[PDB]
Short mmCIF file of C-alpha atoms in Angstrom, two decimals:
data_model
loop_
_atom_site.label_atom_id
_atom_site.label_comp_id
_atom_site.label_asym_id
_atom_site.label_seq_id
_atom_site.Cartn_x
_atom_site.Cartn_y
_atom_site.Cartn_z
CA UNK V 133 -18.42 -25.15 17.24
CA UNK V 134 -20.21 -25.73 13.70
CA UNK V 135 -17.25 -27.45 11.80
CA UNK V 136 -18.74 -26.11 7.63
CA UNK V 137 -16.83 -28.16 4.54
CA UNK V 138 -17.50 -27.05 1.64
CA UNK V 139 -17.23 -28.36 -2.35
CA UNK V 140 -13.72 -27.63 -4.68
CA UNK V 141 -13.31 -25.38 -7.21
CA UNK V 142 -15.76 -25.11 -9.88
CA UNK V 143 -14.85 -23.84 -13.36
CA UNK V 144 -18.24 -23.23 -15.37
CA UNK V 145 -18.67 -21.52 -18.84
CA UNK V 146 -21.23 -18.38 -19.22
CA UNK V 147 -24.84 -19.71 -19.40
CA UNK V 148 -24.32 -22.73 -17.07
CA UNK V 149 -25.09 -23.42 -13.91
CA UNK V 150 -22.87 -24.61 -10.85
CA UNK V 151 -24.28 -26.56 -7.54
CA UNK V 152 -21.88 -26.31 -4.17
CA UNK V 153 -22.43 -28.63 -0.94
CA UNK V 154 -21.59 -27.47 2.57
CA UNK V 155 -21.47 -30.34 4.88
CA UNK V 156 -22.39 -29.50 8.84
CA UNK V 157 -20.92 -31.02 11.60
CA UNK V 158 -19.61 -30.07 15.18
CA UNK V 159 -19.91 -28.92 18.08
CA UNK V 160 -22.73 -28.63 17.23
CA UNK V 161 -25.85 -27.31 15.44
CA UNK V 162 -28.73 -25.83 17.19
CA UNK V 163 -30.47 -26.09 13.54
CA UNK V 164 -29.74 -22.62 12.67
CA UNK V 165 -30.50 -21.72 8.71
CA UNK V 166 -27.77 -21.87 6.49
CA UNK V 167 -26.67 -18.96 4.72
CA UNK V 168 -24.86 -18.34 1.70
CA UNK V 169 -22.44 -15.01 0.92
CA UNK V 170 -20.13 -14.67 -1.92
CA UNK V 171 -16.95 -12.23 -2.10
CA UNK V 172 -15.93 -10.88 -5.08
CA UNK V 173 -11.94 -10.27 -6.09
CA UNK V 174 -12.79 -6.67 -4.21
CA UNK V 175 -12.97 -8.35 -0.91
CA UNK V 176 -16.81 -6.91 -0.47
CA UNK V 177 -19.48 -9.60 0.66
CA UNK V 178 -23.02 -10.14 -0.92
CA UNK V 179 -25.70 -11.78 0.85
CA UNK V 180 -27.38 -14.51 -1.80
CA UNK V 181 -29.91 -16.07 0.59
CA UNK V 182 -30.60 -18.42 3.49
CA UNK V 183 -33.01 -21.67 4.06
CA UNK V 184 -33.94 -23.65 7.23
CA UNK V 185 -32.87 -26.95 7.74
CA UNK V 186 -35.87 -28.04 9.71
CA UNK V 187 -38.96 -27.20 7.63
CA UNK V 188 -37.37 -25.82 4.63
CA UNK V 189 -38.48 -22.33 3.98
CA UNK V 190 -36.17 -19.39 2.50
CA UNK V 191 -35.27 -16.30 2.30
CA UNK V 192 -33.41 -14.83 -0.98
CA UNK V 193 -31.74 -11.91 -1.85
CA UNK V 194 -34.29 -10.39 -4.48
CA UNK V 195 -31.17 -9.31 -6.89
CA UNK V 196 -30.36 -12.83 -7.35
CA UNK V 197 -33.89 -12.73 -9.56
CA UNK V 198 -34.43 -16.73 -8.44
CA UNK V 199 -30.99 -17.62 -10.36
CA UNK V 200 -30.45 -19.07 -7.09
CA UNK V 201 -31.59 -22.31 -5.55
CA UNK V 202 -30.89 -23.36 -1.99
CA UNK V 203 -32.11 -26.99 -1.07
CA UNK V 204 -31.03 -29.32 2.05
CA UNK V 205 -30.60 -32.69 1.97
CA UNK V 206 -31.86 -33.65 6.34
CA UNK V 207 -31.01 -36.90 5.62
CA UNK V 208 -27.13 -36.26 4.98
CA UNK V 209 -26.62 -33.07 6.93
CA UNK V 210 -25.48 -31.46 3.31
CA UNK V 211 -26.71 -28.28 2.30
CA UNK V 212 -26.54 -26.91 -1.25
CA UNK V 213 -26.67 -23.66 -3.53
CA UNK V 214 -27.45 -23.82 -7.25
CA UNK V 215 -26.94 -20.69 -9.13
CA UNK V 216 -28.25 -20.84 -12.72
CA UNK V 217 -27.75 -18.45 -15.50
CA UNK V 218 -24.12 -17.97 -14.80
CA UNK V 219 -22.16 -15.06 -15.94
CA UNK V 220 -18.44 -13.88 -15.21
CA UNK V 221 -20.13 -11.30 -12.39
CA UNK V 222 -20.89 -14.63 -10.71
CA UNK V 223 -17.33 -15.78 -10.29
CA UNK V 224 -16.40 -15.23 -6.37
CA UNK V 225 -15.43 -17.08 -3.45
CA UNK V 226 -18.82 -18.85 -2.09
CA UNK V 227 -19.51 -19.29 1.45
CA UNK V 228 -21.87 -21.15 3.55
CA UNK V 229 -22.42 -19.55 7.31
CA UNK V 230 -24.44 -21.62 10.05
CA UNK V 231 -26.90 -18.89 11.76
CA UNK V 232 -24.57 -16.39 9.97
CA UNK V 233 -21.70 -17.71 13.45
CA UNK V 234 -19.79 -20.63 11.38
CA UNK V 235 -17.86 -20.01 7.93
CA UNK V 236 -17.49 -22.69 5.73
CA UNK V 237 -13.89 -22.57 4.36
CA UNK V 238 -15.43 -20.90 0.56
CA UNK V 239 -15.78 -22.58 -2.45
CA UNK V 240 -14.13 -20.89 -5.56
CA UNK V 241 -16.50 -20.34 -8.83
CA UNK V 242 -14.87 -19.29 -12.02
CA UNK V 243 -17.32 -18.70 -14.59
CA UNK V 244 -15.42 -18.68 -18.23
CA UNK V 245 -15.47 -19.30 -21.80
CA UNK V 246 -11.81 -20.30 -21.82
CA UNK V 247 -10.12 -23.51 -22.44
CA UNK V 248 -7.28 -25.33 -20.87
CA UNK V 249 -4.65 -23.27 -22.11
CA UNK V 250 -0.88 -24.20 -21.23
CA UNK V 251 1.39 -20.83 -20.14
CA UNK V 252 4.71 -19.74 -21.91
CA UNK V 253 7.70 -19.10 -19.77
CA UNK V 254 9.74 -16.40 -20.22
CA UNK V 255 12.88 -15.57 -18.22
CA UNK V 256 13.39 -11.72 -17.20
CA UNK V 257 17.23 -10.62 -17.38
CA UNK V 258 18.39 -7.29 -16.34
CA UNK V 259 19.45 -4.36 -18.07
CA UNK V 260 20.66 -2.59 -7.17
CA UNK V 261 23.24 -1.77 -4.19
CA UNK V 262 24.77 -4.95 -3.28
CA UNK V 263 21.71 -6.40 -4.99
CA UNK V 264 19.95 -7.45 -8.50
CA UNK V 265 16.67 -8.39 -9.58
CA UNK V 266 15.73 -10.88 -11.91
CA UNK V 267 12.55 -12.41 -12.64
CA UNK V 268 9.87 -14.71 -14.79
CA UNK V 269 7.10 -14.24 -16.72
CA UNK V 270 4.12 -16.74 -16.86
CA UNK V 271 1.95 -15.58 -19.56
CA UNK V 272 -1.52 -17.25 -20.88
CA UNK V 273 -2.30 -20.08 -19.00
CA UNK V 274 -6.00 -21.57 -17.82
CA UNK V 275 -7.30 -22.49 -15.37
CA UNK V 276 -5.61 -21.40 -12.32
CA UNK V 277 -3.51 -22.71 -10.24
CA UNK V 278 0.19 -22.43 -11.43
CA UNK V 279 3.14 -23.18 -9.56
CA UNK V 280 6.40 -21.44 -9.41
CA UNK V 281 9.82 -21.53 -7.50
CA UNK V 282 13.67 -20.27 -7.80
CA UNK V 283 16.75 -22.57 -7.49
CA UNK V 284 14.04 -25.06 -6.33
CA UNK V 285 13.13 -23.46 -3.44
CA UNK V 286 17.03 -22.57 -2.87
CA UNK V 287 16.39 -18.74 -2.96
CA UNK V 288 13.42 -17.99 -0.97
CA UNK V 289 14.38 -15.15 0.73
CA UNK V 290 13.30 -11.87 -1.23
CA UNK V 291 11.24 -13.74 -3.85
CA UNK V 292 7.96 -11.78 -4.90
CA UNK V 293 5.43 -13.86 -6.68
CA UNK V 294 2.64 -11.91 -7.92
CA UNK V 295 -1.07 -12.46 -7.86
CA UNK V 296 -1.78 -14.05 -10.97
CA UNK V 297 -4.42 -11.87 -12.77
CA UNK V 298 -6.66 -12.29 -15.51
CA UNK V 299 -6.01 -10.16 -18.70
CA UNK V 300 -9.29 -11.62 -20.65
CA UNK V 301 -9.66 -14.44 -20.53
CA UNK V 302 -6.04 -16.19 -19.78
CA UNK V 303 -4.18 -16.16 -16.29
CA UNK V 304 -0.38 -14.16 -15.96
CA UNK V 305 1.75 -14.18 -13.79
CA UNK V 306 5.49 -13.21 -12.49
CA UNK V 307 7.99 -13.25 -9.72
CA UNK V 308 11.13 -11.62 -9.26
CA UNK V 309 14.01 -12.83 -7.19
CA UNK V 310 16.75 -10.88 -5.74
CA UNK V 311 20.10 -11.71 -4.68
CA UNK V 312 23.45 -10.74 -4.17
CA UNK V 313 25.05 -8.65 -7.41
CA UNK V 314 28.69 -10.92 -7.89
CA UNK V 315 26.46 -13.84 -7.72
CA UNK V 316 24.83 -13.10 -11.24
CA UNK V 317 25.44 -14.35 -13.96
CA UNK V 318 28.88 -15.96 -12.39
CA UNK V 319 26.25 -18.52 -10.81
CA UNK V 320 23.00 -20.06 -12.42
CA UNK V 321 19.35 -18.71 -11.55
CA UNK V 322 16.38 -21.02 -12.59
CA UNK V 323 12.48 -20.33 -12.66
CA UNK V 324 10.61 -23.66 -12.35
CA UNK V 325 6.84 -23.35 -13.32
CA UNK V 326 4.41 -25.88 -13.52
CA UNK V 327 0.73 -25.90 -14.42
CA UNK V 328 -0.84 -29.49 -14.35
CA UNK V 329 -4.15 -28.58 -15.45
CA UNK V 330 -1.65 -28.62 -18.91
CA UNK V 331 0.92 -30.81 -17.96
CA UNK V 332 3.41 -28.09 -18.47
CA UNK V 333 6.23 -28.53 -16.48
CA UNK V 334 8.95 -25.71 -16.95
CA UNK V 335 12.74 -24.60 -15.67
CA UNK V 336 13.91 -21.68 -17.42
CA UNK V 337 17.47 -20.64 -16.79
CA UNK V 338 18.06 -16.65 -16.99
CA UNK V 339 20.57 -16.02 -19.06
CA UNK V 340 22.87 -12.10 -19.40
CA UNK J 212 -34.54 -21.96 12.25
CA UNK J 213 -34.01 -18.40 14.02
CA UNK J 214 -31.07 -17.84 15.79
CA UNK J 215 -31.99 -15.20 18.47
CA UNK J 216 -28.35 -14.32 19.01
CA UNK J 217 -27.85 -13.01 15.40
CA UNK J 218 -31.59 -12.17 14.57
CA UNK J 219 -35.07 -11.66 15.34
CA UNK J 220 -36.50 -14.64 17.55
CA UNK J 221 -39.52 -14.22 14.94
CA UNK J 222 -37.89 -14.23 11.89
CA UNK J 223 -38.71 -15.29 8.25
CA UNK J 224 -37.90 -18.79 9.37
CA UNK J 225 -40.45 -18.66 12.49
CA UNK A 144 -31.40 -2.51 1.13
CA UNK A 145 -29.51 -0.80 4.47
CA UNK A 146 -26.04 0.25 2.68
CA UNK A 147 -23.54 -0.21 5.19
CA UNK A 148 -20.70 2.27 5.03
CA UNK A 149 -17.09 1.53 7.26
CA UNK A 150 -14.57 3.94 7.76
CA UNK A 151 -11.65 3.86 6.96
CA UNK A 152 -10.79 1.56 4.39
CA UNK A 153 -7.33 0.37 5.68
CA UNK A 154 -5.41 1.22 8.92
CA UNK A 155 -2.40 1.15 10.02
CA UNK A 156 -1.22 0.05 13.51
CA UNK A 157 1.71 -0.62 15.17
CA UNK A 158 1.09 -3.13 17.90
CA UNK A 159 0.01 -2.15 20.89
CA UNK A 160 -1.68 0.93 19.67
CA UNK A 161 -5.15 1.17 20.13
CA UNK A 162 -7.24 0.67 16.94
CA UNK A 163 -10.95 2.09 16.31
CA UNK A 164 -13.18 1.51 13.06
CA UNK A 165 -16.13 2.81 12.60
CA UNK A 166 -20.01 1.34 10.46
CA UNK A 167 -22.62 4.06 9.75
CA UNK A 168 -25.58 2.84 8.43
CA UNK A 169 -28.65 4.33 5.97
CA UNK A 170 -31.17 3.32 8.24
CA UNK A 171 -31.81 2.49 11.77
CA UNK A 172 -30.82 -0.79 12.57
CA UNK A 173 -33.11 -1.14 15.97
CA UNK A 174 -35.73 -3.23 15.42
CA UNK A 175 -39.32 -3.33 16.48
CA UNK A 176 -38.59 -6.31 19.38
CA UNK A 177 -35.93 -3.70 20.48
CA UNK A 178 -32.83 -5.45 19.65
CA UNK A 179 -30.07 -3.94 17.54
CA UNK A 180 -28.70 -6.34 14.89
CA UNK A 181 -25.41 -5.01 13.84
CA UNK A 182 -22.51 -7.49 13.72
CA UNK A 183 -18.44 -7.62 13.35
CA UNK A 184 -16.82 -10.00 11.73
CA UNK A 185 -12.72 -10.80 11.06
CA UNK A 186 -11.14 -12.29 8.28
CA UNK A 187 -7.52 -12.97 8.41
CA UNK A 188 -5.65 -13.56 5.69
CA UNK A 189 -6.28 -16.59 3.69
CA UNK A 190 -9.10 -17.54 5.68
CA UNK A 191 -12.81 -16.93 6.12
CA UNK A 192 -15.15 -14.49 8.26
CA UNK A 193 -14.94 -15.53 11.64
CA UNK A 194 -17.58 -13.51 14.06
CA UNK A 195 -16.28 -11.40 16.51
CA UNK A 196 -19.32 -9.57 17.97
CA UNK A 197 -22.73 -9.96 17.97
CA UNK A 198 -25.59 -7.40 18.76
CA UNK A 199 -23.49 -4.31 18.80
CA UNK A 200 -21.11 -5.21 22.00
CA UNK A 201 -21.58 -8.80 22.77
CA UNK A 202 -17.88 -10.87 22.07
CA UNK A 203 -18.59 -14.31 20.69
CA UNK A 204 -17.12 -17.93 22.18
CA UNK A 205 -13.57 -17.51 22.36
CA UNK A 206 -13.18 -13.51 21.52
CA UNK A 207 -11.01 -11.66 23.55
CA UNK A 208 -11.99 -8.63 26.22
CA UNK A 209 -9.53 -6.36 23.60
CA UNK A 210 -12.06 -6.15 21.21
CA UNK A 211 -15.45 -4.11 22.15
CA UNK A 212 -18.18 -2.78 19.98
CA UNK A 213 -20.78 0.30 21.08
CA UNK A 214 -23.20 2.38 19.31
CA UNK A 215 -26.44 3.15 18.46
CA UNK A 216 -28.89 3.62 15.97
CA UNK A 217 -26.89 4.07 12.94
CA UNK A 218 -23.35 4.69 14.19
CA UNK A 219 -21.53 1.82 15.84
CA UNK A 220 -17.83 1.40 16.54
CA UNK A 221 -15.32 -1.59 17.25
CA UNK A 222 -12.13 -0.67 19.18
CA UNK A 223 -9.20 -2.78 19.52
CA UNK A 224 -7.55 -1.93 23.56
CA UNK A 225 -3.91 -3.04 22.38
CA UNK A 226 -3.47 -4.81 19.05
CA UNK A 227 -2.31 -8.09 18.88
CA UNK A 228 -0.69 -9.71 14.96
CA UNK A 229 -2.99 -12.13 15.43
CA UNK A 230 -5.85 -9.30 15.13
CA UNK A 231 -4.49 -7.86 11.96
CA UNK A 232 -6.95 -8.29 8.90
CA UNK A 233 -10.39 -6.89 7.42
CA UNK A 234 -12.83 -6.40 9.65
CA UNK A 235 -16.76 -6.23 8.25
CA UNK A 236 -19.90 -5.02 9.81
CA UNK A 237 -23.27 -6.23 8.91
CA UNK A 238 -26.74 -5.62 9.74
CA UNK A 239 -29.38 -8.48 9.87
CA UNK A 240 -32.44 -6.26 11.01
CA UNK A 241 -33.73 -5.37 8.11
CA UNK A 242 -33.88 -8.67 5.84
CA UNK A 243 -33.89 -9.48 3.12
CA UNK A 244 -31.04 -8.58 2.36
CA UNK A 245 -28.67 -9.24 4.84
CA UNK A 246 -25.70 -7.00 4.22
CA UNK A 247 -22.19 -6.10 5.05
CA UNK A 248 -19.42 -2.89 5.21
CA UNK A 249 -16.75 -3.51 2.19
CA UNK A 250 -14.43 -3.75 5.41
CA UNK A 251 -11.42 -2.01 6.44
CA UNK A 252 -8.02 -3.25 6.54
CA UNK A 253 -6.37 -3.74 9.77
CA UNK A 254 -2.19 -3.36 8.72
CA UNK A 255 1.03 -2.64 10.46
CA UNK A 256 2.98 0.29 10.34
CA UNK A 257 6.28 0.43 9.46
CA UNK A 258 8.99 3.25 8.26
CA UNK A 259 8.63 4.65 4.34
CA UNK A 260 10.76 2.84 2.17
CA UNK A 261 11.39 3.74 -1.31
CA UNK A 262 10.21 1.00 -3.90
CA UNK A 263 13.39 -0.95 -5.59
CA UNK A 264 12.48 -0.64 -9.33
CA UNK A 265 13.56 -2.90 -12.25
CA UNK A 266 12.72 -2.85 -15.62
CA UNK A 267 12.99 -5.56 -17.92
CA UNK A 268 12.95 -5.64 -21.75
CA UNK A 269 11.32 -8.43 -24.15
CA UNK A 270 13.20 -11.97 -23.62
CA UNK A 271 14.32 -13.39 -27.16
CA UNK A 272 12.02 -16.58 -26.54
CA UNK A 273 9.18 -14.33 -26.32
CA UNK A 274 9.75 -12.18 -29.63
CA UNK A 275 10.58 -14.92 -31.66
CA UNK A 276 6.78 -15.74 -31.18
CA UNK A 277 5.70 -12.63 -32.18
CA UNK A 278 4.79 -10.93 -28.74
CA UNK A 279 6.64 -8.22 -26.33
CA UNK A 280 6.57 -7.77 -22.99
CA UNK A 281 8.28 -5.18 -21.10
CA UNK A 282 7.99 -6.02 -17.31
CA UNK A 283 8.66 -3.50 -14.23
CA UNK A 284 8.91 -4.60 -10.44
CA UNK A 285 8.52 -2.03 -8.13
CA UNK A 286 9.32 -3.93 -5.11
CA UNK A 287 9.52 -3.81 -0.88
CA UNK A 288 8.44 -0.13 -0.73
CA UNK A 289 5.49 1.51 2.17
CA UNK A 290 3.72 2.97 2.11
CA UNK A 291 1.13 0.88 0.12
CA UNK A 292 -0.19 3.62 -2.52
CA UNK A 293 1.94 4.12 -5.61
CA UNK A 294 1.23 4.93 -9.02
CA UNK A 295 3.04 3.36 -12.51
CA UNK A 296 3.04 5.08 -15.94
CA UNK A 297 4.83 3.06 -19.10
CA UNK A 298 6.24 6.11 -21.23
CA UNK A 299 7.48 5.40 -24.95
CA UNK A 300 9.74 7.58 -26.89
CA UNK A 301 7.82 10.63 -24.89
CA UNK A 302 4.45 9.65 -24.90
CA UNK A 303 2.49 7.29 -22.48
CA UNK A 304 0.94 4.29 -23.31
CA UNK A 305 -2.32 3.01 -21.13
CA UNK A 306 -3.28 -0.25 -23.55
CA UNK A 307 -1.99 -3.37 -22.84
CA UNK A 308 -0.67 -2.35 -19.35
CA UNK A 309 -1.22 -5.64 -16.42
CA UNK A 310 -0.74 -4.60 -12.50
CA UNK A 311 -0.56 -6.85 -9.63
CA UNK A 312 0.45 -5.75 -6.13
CA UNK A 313 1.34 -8.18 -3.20
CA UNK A 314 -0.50 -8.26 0.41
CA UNK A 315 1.66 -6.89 3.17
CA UNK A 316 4.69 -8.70 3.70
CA UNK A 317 5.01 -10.92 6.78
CA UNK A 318 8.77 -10.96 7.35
CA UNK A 319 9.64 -6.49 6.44
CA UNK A 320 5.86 -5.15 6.36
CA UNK A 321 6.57 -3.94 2.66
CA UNK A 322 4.58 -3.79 -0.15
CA UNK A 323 4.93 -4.67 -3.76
CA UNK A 324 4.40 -4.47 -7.43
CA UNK A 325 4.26 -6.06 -10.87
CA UNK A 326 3.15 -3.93 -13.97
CA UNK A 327 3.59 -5.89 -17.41
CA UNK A 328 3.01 -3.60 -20.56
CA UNK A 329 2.22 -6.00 -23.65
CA UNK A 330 2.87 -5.16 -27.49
CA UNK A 331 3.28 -7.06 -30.55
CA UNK A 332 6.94 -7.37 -31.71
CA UNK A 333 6.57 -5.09 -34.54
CA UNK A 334 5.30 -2.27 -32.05
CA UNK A 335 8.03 -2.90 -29.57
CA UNK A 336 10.52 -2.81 -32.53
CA UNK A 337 8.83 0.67 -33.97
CA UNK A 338 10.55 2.42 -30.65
CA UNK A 339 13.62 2.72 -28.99
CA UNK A 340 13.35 4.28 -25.62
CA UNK A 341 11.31 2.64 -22.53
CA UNK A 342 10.42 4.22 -19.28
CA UNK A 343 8.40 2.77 -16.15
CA UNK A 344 7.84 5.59 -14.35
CA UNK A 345 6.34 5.79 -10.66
CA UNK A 346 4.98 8.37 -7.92
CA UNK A 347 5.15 7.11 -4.74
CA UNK A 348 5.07 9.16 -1.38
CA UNK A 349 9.02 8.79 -0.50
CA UNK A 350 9.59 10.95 -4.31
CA UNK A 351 8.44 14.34 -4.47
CA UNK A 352 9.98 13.63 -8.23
CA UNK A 353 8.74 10.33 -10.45
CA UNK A 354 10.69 7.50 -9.81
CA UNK A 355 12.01 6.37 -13.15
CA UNK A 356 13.99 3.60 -14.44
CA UNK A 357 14.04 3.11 -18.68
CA UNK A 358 16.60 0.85 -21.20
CA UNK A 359 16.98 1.82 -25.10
CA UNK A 360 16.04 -1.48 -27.18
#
């Protein structure tokens, strides 16, 4: 039982560089050598490299082209990647693996020229058996995350909330919510967005 | 160093 | 670099069945010390890897006797006896004999069956806060259908229009087993005004005919 924790979310603009910790405990080690894998938005895993904790040699994946750095401090039981040279290819989920056994939970790396950028809010109206769909529309925002909920949480059932994707280089997203068909418009439905990298804080009633 | 249950006992790291 | 290829990319299982995936790799993955490093891992949902079996057929510390791996040389194979929820997921192989690289399958999706259902489709025009600022766009749902593959086209007056379009689909949903989608087409107000008539239009298994649903501006 190797218990991995890795480093938050890094945001890093193209040309920069971007250093992640993974801190070992458990269970526990046998001093395997840390590893380091990143999965892109396709799911598919890359091997970057992997170094020894004891004596400190490596081993790197040759298409990294020495962009990548892995160093461990003994003295703290951290371990660390430093990729350099950064590009939007680069941005992935990061993982450190003990002895390629133990996952660290993944470290997010979002490599952009953007700025903060607050979203606009735009309520979907219609125009169904017993049913209609409404929905909201959470257009340009950066960095991720955003938040979003109907009726406050009230309708939950059949709410879809979409991955939010990224149309270069700003965030959208939507959700649609569907109730019963007398029920709209006779009684009120709300989005409620937030996004506090912004301090946007939203509730957008759709109207007929 | 090597872990002989995922890799060669003489690995790079040997 | 060994390219490791799994087959197929997503499968779907009702529980119980019995489930079998399959890693073929470009080179021969037994090594000189006569050990064969090929590797399965699982990742569930929201979470990371987690291994599953080591050295072809060996189960890892707390791995089930459901799961089993065989194989040789360049073909290996995981089988699942009687799938459990809990076992639903990607699964990845990857081969650590010849390093460097290490490397890994683009995995196959482990998903549960469930009967076709016809997407739900709404379509939704421009709100007035948005065109005020100068922008349009026209949003379609396609929502709770299976299976998973489905196709959207955004037709205009008669013609179709690929620029500006934005897709998202959903994961598998835990409650029905459904799938859905989002596709957002994006113009400027004076090019949503310069037309009248708006289709989404899809193709999904359950329609031998598109699946349309439109509004006149």
């Amino acid at each position: 039982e190797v218990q991995l924790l890795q480093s938050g979310p890094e945001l890093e603009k193209p040309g920069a560089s971007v250093m992640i910790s993974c801190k070992a405990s458990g269970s526990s080690f046998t001093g395997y050598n840390m590893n380091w894998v990143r999965q892109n938005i396709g799911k598919s895993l890359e091997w970057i490299g992997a170094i020894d904790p004891y004596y400190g040699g490596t081993s790197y994946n040759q298409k990294f082209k020495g962009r990548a750095t892995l160093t461990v401090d003994k003295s703290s039981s951290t371990a660390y990647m430093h990729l350099k040279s950064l590009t939007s290819e680069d941005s992935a989920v990061y993982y450190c693996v003990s002895g390629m056994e133990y996952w660290g939970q993944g470290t997010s790396v979002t490599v952009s020229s953007a700025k903060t950028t607050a979203p606009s809010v735009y309520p979907l109206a219609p125009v169904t058996g017993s049913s209609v769909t409404l929905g909201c529309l959470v257009k340009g925002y950066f960095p991720e995350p955003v938040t979003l909920t109907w009726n406050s949480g009230s309708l939950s059932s059949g709410v879809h909330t979409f991955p939010a994707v990224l149309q270069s280089d700003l965030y959208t997203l939507s959700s649609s919510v569907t109730v019963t068909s007398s029920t709209w418009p006779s009684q009120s439905i709300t989005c409620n967005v937030a996004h506090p990298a912004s301090s946007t804080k939203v509730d957008k009633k759709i109207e007929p | 160093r090597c872990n002989p249950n995922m890799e060669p006992p003489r690995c790079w790291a040997a | 670099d060994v390219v490791m290829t799994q087959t197929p990319l997503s499968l779907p299982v009702s529980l119980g069945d019995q489930a079998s995936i399959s890693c073929r790799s470009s080179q021969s993955l037994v090594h000189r010390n006569g050990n064969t490093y090929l590797h399965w891992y699982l990742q569930k949902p929201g979470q990371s890897p987690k291994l599953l079996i080591h050295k072809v057929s060996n189960r890892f510390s707390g791995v089930p006797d459901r799961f089993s791996g065989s194989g040789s040389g360049t073909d290996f194979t995981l089988k699942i006896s009687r799938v459990e929820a809990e076992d639903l997921g990607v699964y990845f192989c990857s081969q650590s004999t010849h390093v460097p690289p290490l490397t890994f399958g683009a995995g196959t999706k482990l998903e549960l069956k469930r009967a076709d259902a016809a997407p739900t489709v709404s379509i939704f025009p421009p709100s007035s806060e948005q065109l005020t600022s100068g922008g349009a766009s026209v949003v379609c749902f396609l929502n709770n259908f299976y299976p998973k593959d489905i196709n959207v086209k955004w037709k205009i007056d008669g013609s179709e229009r690929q620029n500006g379009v934005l897709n998202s689909w959903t994961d598998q949903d835990s409650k029905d087993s459904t799938y859905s989608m989002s596709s957002t087409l994006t113009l400027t107000k004076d090019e949503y005004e310069r037309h009248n008539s708006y289709t989404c239009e899809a193709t999904h298994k359950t329609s031998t005919s598109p699946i349309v649903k439109s509004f006149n501006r």
